[PDB]
A = this chain, B = another copy of it.
Amino acid sequence: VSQVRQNYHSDCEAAVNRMLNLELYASYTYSSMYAFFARDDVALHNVAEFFKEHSHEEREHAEKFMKYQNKRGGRVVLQDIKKPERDEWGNTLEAMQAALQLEKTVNQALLDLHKLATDKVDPHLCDFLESEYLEEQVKDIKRIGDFITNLKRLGLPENGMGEYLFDKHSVKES
């Protein structure tokens, strides 16, 4: 047993390792979306940069779980990072729809970890999730939903002019 460990259940330790992996998986998916939108035959570079920034965010969130594990006296255990589900992402609407689903998947895993922490009477882990993850997660889901609404309004997938305009106005100039 680690000399620092106190009130830290083995199940929570394992679930934090699984969260770490899921954040890395999410980062890698967003990296794939970045590369797709930067293709010469896609060429929506502000959309590409949005996804690149989200990849970096998810990697930072993985790092925060590594540090959490060590602070509690758990032990980081890494697994393979699975490649993304698709190699090509269709268009801005399909990608944003996939991002919404990804963000909801990550949110459900966070919520499930909060349930576990609650069951194991671990208020430090509850706090960590509430303070560092849950709200920023709700904000991301909201933003992507707002984007999907606007992509539909702009006539995606058919309306290429609409897609062009989204890249100029909805996402920040890179």
Chain A's interface size range is 35 or more
| Interface of chain A residues 96 through 136 with chain B (CB within 8 A) | 100, 104, 107-108, 111, 114-115, 118, 121, 123-124, 126-131, 134-135
Q: In the complex the two chains form, what is the Cα distance from A123 to B113 in whole Å?
A: 11
Task: Name the residue on B nearest A114 (C-beta).
Answer: B123
Task: Name the residue on B nearest A68 (C-beta).
Answer: B138
Q: Is the CB of B138 within 8 A of A124?
A: yes
Chain A residues in the interface with B (C-beta under 8 A): 2-4, 6-7, 24, 28, 31-32, 34-36, 38-43, 45, 59, 63, 66-67, 69-73, 75-84, 87, 100, 104, 107-108, 111, 114-115, 118, 121, 123-124, 126-131, 134-135, 138-139, 141-142, 145-150, 152-155, 159-165, 168-169
